């Protein structure tokens with residue numbers, strides 16, 4: 010039921026907050042450095058630090074601008090916060106294998 | 114971020130947005146993208162008409178030629194166009210050019 | 211052609227053919243109530259383990275299943291857990307990937 014940072018245990022999200030974007034909470038994507046990510050979309054997250062200013066370049070999600078989301082505790086790259094869009098205006102795409110799932 | 118399509122499992126290049134030709138379908142128990150062209154698949158078996166979602170086309174199984182994952186089907190025997198590829202959205206990764 | 215062996219003693223435990231995508235993936239990163247973090251791979255079957263204890267539903271990572279601790283039957287290394295009492299499948303194993311060694315049949 011709760012998602013923590015796999016590296017340090019920082020509280021990040023919850024299964025209840027998963028968000029099916031275009032029909033599915035899970036999206037498999039690659040960046041221009043050819044890294045493949047299994048991204049889980051969440052309506053809400055906490056315990057992150059969002060770094061820099063949003064950018065629309067290479068956005069996987071139509072109409073959204075992204076900011077890099079680090080673990081606020083350990084600094085590990087956990088995914089991205091998306092904004093600037095519609096329905097919803099904002100959400101988080103977190104890298105599923107950087108999280109640890111467990112009891113509430 | 115979404116002009117090239119690759120195998121989800123291993124990252125083999127399969128197709129591109131320029132070749133798109135999102136059908137939601139039900140097998141007899143998918144969000145399929147149709148493409149005019151693809152690469153890096155291996156098409157296996159003999160074409161079959163059984164439960165073909167596309168009227169007048171027979172299908173052949175399309176595997177990723179790099180790792181063997183099942184990515185969708187190749188359709189032949191129809192008209193306008195004669196042939197195309199129907200790939201399973203959830204088996205692809207999307208990314209930049 | 212791939213089997214998983216106990217990393218400590220070499221006993222054959224499971225097969226790659228038996229990898230099971232529970233909730234969409236065979237790999238789950240999980241944490242127990244003492245905050246220990248494990249990277250678990252799900253298999254339908256296994257062999258050469260010894261399940262200890264009565265099944266328990268408390269804190270199960272997989273809803274609708276009870277768990278029992280699974281040790282290597284040969285050397286006693288803690289390799290994961292067995293799950294039972296659910297449906298489709300009724301039972302399966304969550305094994306600690308870092309405590310296995312994968313290799314040819």
Ligand SMILES: COc1c(N)c(F)cc(C(=O)N[C@H]2CCC(=O)NC2=O)c1F
Pocket residue numbers: 039040041042066067068069070075089114
């Ligand atoms: C700006 O060039 C880069 C470089 N050079 C990079 F090394 C990595 C990225 C990167 O991971 N971007 C993600 C951000 C989130 C999104 O939705 N799509 C992406 O593709 C990137 F954009």
Ligand SMILES: COc1c(N)c(F)cc(C(=O)N[C@H]2CCC(=O)NC2=O)c1F
Pocket residue numbers: 241242243244268269270271272277291
């Ligand atoms: C009963 O309190 C404990 C203590 N004290 C412990 F030190 C470890 C565990 C433990 O590892 N539990 C696993 C069992 C397998 C599963 O699916 N979920 C878990 O959370 C545990 F439950």
Ligand SMILES: [Zn+2]
Pocket residue numbers: 014015016017018019080081082083084085
């Ligand atoms: Zn962290």
Ligand SMILES: [Zn+2]
Pocket residue numbers: 120121122123124125177178179180181182
């Ligand atoms: Zn592949």
Ligand SMILES: [Zn+2]
Pocket residue numbers: 216217218219220221282283284285286287
């Ligand atoms: Zn052993």
